Amino acid sequence: FFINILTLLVPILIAMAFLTLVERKILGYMQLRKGPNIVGPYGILQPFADAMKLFMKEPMRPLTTSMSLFIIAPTLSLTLALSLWVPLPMPHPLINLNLGILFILATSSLSVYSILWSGWASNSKYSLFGALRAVAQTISYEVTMAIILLSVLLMNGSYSLQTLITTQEHMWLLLPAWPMAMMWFISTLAETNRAPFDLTEGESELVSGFNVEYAAGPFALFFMAEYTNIILMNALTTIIFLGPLYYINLPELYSTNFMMEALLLSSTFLWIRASYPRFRYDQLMHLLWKNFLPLTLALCMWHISLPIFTAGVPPY
Amino acid sequence: EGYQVPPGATYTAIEAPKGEFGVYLVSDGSSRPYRCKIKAPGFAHLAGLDKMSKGHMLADVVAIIGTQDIVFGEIDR
Amino acid sequence: VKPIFSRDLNEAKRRVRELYRAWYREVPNTVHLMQLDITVKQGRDKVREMFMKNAHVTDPRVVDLLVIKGKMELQETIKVWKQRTHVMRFFHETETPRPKDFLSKFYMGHD
Amino acid sequence: LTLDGIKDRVLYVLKLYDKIDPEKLSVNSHFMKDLGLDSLDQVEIIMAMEDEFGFEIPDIDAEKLMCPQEIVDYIADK
Amino acid sequence: LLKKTTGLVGLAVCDTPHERLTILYTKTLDILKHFPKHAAYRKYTEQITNEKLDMVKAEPDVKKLEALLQGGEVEEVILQAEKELSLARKMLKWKPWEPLVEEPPANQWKWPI
Amino acid sequence: SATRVIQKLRNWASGQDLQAKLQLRYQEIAKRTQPPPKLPVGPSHKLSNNYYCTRDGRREVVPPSIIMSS
Amino acid sequence: RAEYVVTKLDDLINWARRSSLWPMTFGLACCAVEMMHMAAPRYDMDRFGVVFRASPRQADVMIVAGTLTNKMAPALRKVYDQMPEPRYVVSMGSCANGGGYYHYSYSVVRGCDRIVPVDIYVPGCPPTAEALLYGILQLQRKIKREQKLKIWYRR
Amino acid sequence: NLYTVIFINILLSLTLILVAFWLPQMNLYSEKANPYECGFDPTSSARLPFSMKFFLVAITFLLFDLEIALLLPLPWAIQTIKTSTMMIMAFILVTILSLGLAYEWTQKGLE
Amino acid sequence: PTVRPRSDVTHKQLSAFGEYVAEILPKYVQQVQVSCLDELEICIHPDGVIPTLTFLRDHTNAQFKSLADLTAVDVPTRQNRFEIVYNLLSLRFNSRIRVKTYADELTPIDSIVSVHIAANWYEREVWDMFGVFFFNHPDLRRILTDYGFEGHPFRKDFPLTGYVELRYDDEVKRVVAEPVELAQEFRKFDLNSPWEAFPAYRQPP
Amino acid sequence: DMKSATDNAARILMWTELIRGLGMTLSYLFREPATINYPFEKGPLSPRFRGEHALRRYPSGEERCIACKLCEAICPAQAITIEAEPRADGSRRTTRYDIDMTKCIYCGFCQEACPVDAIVEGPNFEFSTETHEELLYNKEKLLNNGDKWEAEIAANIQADYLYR
Ligand code: SF4
Ligand code: SF4
Ligand code: SF4
Numbered sequence A: 001f002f003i004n005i006l007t008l009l010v011p012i013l014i015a016m017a018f019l020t021l022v023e024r025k026i027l028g029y030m031q032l033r034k035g036p037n038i039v040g041p042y043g044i045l046q047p048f049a050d051a052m053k054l055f056m057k058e059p060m061r062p063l064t065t066s067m068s069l070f071i072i073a074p075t076l077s078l079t080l081a082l083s084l085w086v087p088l089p090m091p092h093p094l095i096n097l098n099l100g101i102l103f104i105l106a107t108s109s110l111s112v113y114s115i116l117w118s119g120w121a122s123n124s125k126y127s128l129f130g131a132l133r134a135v136a137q138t139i140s141y142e143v144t145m146a147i148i149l150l151s152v153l154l155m156n157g158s159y160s161l162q163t164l165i166t167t168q169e170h171m172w173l174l175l176p177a178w179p180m181a182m183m184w185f186i187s188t189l190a191e192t193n194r195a196p197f198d199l200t201e202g203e204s205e206l207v208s209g210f211n212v213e214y215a216a217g218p219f220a221l222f223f224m225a226e227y228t229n230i231i232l233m234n235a236l237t238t239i240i241f242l243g244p245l246y247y248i249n250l251p252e253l254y255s256t257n258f259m260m261e262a263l264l265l266s267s268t269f270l271w272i273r274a275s276y277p278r279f280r281y282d283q284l285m286h287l288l289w290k291n292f293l294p295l296t297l298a299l300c301m302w303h304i305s306l307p308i309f310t311a312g313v314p315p316y
Numbered sequence B: 001e002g003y004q005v006p007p008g009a010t011y012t013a014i015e016a017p018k019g020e021f022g023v024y025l026v027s028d029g030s031s032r033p034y035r036c037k038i039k040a041p042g043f044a045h046l047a048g049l050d051k052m053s054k055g056h057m058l059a060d061v062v063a064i065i066g067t068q069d070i071v072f073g074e075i076d077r
Numbered sequence C: 001v002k003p004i005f006s007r008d009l010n011e012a013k014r015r016v017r018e019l020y021r022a023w024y025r026e027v028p029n030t031v032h033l034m035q036l037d038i039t040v041k042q043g044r045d046k047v048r049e050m051f052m053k054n055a056h057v058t059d060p061r062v063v064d065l066l067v068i069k070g071k072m073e074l075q076e077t078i079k080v081w082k083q084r085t086h087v088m089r090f091f092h093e094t095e096t097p098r099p100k101d102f103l104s105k106f107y108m109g110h111d
Numbered sequence D: 001l002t003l004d005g006i007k008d009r010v011l012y013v014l015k016l017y018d019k020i021d022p023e024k025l026s027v028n029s030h031f032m033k034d035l036g037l038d039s040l041d042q043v044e045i046i047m048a049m050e051d052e053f054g055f056e057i058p059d060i061d062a063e064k065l066m067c068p069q070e071i072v073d074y075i076a077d078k
Numbered sequence E: 001l002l003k004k005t006t007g008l009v010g011l012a013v014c015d016t017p018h019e020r021l022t023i024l025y026t027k028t029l030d031i032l033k034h035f036p037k038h039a040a041y042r043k044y045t046e047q048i049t050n051e052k053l054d055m056v057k058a059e060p061d062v063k064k065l066e067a068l069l070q071g072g073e074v075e076e077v078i079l080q081a082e083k084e085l086s087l088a089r090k091m092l093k094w095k096p097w098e099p100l101v102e103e104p105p106a107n108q109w110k111w112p113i
Numbered sequence F: 001s002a003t004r005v006i007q008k009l010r011n012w013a014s015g016q017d018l019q020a021k022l023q024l025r026y027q028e029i030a031k032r033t034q035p036p037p038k039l040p041v042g043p044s045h046k047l048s049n050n051y052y053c054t055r056d057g058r059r060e061v062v063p064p065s066i067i068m069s070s
Numbered sequence G: 001r002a003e004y005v006v007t008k009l010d011d012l013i014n015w016a017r018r019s020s021l022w023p024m025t026f027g028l029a030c031c032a033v034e035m036m037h038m039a040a041p042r043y044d045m046d047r048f049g050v051v052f053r054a055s056p057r058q059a060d061v062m063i064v065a066g067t068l069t070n071k072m073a074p075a076l077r078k079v080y081d082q083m084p085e086p087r088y089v090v091s092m093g094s095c096a097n098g099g100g101y102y103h104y105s106y107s108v109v110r111g112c113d114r115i116v117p118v119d120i121y122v123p124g125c126p127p128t129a130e131a132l133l134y135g136i137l138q139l140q141r142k143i144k145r146e147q148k149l150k151i152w153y154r155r
Numbered sequence H: 001n002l003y004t005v006i007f008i009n010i011l012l013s014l015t016l017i018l019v020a021f022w023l024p025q026m027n028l029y030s031e032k033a034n035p036y037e038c039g040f041d042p043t044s045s046a047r048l049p050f051s052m053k054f055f056l057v058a059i060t061f062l063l064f065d066l067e068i069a070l071l072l073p074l075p076w077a078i079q080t081i082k083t084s085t086m087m088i089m090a091f092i093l094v095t096i097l098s099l100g101l102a103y104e105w106t107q108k109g110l111e
Numbered sequence I: 001p002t003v004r005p006r007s008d009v010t011h012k013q014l015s016a017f018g019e020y021v022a023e024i025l026p027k028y029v030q031q032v033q034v035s036c037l038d039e040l041e042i043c044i045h046p047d048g049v050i051p052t053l054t055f056l057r058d059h060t061n062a063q064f065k066s067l068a069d070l071t072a073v074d075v076p077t078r079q080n081r082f083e084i085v086y087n088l089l090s091l092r093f094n095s096r097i098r099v100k101t102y103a104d105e106l107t108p109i110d111s112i113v114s115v116h117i118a119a120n121w122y123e124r125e126v127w128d129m130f131g132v133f134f135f136n137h138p139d140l141r142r143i144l145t146d147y148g149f150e151g152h153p154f155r156k157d158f159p160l161t162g163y164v165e166l167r168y169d170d171e172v173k174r175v176v177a178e179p180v181e182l183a184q185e186f187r188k189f190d191l192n193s194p195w196e197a198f199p200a201y202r203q204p205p
Numbered sequence J: 001d002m003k004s005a006t007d008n009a010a011r012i013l014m015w016t017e018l019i020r021g022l023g024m025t026l027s028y029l030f031r032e033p034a035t036i037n038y039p040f041e042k043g044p045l046s047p048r049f050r051g052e053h054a055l056r057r058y059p060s061g062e063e064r065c066i067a068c069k070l071c072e073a074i075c076p077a078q079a080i081t082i083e084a085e086p087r088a089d090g091s092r093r094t095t096r097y098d099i100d101m102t103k104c105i106y107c108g109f110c111q112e113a114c115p116v117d118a119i120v121e122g123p124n125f126e127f128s129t130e131t132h133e134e135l136l137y138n139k140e141k142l143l144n145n146g147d148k149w150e151a152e153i154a155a156n157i158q159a160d161y162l163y164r
Helices: A002-030 A048-056 A068-080 A099-111 A114-122 A125-151 A176-190 A216-241 A252-275 A279-309 B043-045 B058-068 C011-028 C041-053 C060-078 C101-107 D006-016 D041-051 D059-064 D069-075 E017-031 E041-059 E061-067 E073-093 F002-014 G003-019 G035-037 G073-082 G129-145 G148-153 H001-020 H055-071 H082-106 I008-024 I047-057 I118-131 J002-011 J016-024 J140-148 J150-160
Strands: B010-012 B022-028 B034-035 G060-066 G088-092 G121-123 I031-034 I042-043 I067-069 I072-074 I084-091 I096-103 I164-168 I176-181 J052-055 J119-122
Touching: A002 A048, A002 A068, A002 A216, A002 H001, A002 I031, A048 A216, A048 C041, A048 G003, A048 H001, A068 A114, A068 A216, A068 H001, A099 A125, A099 A216, A099 C041, A114 A125, A114 G003, A125 A176, A125 A279, A125 C060, A125 H055, A176 A216, A176 A279, A176 I008, A216 A252, A252 J016, A279 H055, A279 H082, B010 I031, B022 C041, B034 I072, B043 B058, B043 I118, C011 C041, C011 D041, C011 D059, C041 F002, C041 G148, D006 D041, D006 D069, D041 D059, D069 I042, E017 E061, E017 E073, E061 E073, G003 G121, G003 G129, G003 G148, G073 I047, G073 I072, G073 I176, G088 G129, G121 G129, H055 H082, H082 J052, I008 I031, I008 I042, I008 I047, I042 I047, I047 I084, I047 I096, I067 I118, I118 J150, J002 J016, J119 J140, J140 J150
Parallel strands: G060 G088, G088 G121, I042 I096
Antiparallel strands: B010 B022, B022 B034, I031 I042, I067 I084, I072 I084, I084 I096, I164 I176, J052 J119
């Protein structure tokens, strides 16, 4: 078990730093630059040097802060994002939780709490604006997050995340739910806090939002939890709305199908990050609550309608 | 020494792509200017930003300083 | 000559008394709120000696322009456009004073 | 209320004031004549009286104020 | 038909431009009746408003009113003529037609000095 | 200097001829080792009629005319 | 002989700081458009691994571009003090060098060396983005060649 | 298993916090640890009453959170004998959940 | 080709407009100068600057709605040393006008906020740089000088290099002020040639 | 019509104009990047590039700076102090030259003022230093700067002197 949690947790941190590496490289390729290829063999050494350098960067204990809550926020954010990864289905999950997608939804609702704890306990007006817009991003994302995670999972009929693997062996899940996939994508941009719907760590809005007072290793923990949440909910959109091929004798073909589909989905996540202009929280609350909340409730109505329209109800 | 410049005042407002740019040179008859005001285009724009930013929020005001295109060397002089 | 506010000296002196009352009212808020490295008593003595620095003028338009310059200092002191660096360069904590006797001015420089 | 206690409090505030000597303190002592006070130190001592008591005294009232018996008789009648 | 877009923003279009222009030109003619005849602002303002009001009662078309007013658009000359009306009342309050209140020193307007 | 499959991929993404008009200068730069260009003289490099008092632009100005008052 | 181990760990602990240096999204200048020209994809920041982070707490080095005036001086130094103690100063521009233009003016601080400790001086009112790429490379090798664990070991 | 992954995850995050703290040098001062508002003395305390304007949208989030909590047992509710009963009544429930937002959108509650 | 060509039709029609404004405002207009550069320089009296600019903005035949520029030029020979300009510019007539009044540093000029809100910042800039009181301004707060900068800098009696100069110390850890002594003296050049430059602009003795 | 209604109702609710913008960003990640590895690949400059100031020389010894005191009357930095003496040779050179690289606006006025083209602005940018003293170029640093870059300057002056 300990060898399994080492080979799950240490390669996901190395792959998260290498995701930051290929994020900056494909982001700079979008912005017509070659990217950080000098310091590594084709640049395979730069966010490892960032995670090294932010250790002996000086941390900050300000006058105005409360230091216990100020230091208990990023350690809970790292524990949060690295223990959100364990009810992921994969071929076979490490935690075979019976209703684990509600734990995913609950700890992603916990993911928009450590940012508010940080933005209060930093004791800056800038961090307080970032904390209030993190509350506004909760107000935006959370009910449409739960309704998209409810209504298309009513077609699977169970909150066990293992039962979605057997559902979509021959066909994908974006073919029965194409508006639900793109509305899940634009709500998971709000939970992930990436540059379409990033409104609480922005250099043009505030001075980087909620990371005003956070230097060094705690800022490395917040960046760690940030990019762990990026690859995490890329894997969530991968594991719900697209269906890879399952052979029960060969899970490795399923894992490399997961690899190519998750690499194109993380490529379109950082492509949709680096393309668009960045929102304002008035029209974020306006387009979600006025436009995309009754569309989620109406496709939720149509997902009430479908198992009595045909075929019976799904299995337990 | 430079140019011995005849005295008098001129001000030549040309189209800067921020707006009005024109310099109010006065000459003493020597080769030095006596004074000039350099017309910043955005000086009156950022004077009038208080009118146009009412009833909005902070992302709208950073959108309006990006719209109005204020760089500050000509304005602070 | 055209006046500014005051047709005499004592009405401008009353305006000077009003500005001194508002400055004495304002300065413990800009000791406590400014996180300043002084007490309130030598700050009030600094306000009093800055009033006594321009005490020699009996001209009403000059002291009315001193009233608007003290009002702009009051406007930048009630609100915190001035900071802890700008607000107490008046104390001269770093600059040594120029000596007033003849012998030290003889030793220092050609003045 | 406390018509002698307000005189005790004005002796308290001119005892807590520093420029006026307490042996030279009197109930009929002139401020600008024999206490070494200029035209803003009267404003200083009645503004210390103002923050000690709470009721407002204007600067129009300050130049007519000379000795505080008439202002404590003005404020003692409620 | 009346224009939906006014050619501007904030200066809203009006439905009766002939009526507002005749009514406010008679109002700014009536304001200058309390001006003195010795004041030559009364003569030149009465000349320009009488000639422009003669153009208004000459032409009934709105674009021909714009072309013979020569002030851009009809809402712009409505706005500027109401500023002229407020100017005529304010210069009744100020009375500038009397002569110069103070001669300058003789070195004040000499360049170079 | 891209290949035809990725060139047709970005032509599918655009609809424009990026291969014909790239944003990066390949060989459209003129050669930086140049012949020395003899600059022409102006209109008043003439030895005859070279009088400065006819062409004198800095003495033809007048001090400004006070038209009406004082 | 642990001095070789100390110097190799010092080079390994300075390799991360010389590679992944994070500057500050600064301004204050005519010269500050050339910070955006290093950001521009001809003479690139991010190829060497240089990321414009707005916060001082995220920043590792302040690129002071240009005009340092008297109103901006406590706003400069209150930002620079709150930058945490791995901190270097590049001074882009002759106004950040010595008060290049506006030297004998009334409200310009006469260089940024008057206020902050400046580790490297970049000349130019255009400093070329090649020239501040040289400044980033030379500050990079300066904090490479500093020896903190070596002077800790012979202490 | 979930307890030991939460325990070893918070222990690795705690030793990341400890190797953030005790590995560099320790030297602080008051100008360093002053709070950040682009480098200025505090005009006001940050802990002050903020009169933000998304308050009715925030309470509508709380009621919609409660509504999706009663919506949440639906994959077990679809496995029942009274399918038409849960169908008609759940249609009524999410219809009035949409109708509350329809009244808020009519009466400008989301601005 | 060297000399700029001269179009005198604009000179005579703007001179007719200058005679027009000099006749219609005889109380305030002290003179009107017309240069050779087809622009007008109406020099007025500072007690009535607001009838002059409300007449120049609101009238249908002047129509200078947009204010452009506002400073002084400080000539210390005159008894009223500041020479306050108002450069205004018509959008509709495609023309320009200059209004020049005077100022002492004790005699105020009543402000022009009520006619143009363009001068909400220009008059504050003038109060920094030269130092004239502006009557009934909303706020005449200092803008371009330092917070606590004693001295209006654009006058001729203020020096080039100033009086204070900032410097960080580690005694107090603030950006403190010192009286300036220079690292290098600004070398004052005698750029005035001693020979007579323009015979048209000759000063009589 | 109804077709414009389907076009607008497919622009909204599919966000296909945002898919259009996504593809327009997608087209440039398959392009060649325009960066250069700076200490190995250096970018385009010109022979008129006013860079580091440098004092040239005549082609047979003999320092070209003839002490005119006109290049500080044109210098807007007031950076140049060129207090000279005779050389006790009958010639006319400088004993005190100072530019200030920290002042020094890099404006090209002194390279166009100079009647013999003694000071030039040689095309350099690799002179960013670490202390303030090393950007205070007096006379010998300027002379061996021009001696260092004399083969680089003179071909640019030979290709550039028809323009000036
Ligand atoms: S050195 Fe020159 S361009 Fe650079 S900041 Fe100063 S004035 Fe602006
Ligand atoms: S550098 Fe040129 S202009 Fe200057 S003194 Fe020397 S020779 Fe003369
Ligand atoms: S390049 Fe310009 S600023 Fe530098 S020394 Fe030459 S003239 Fe002076």
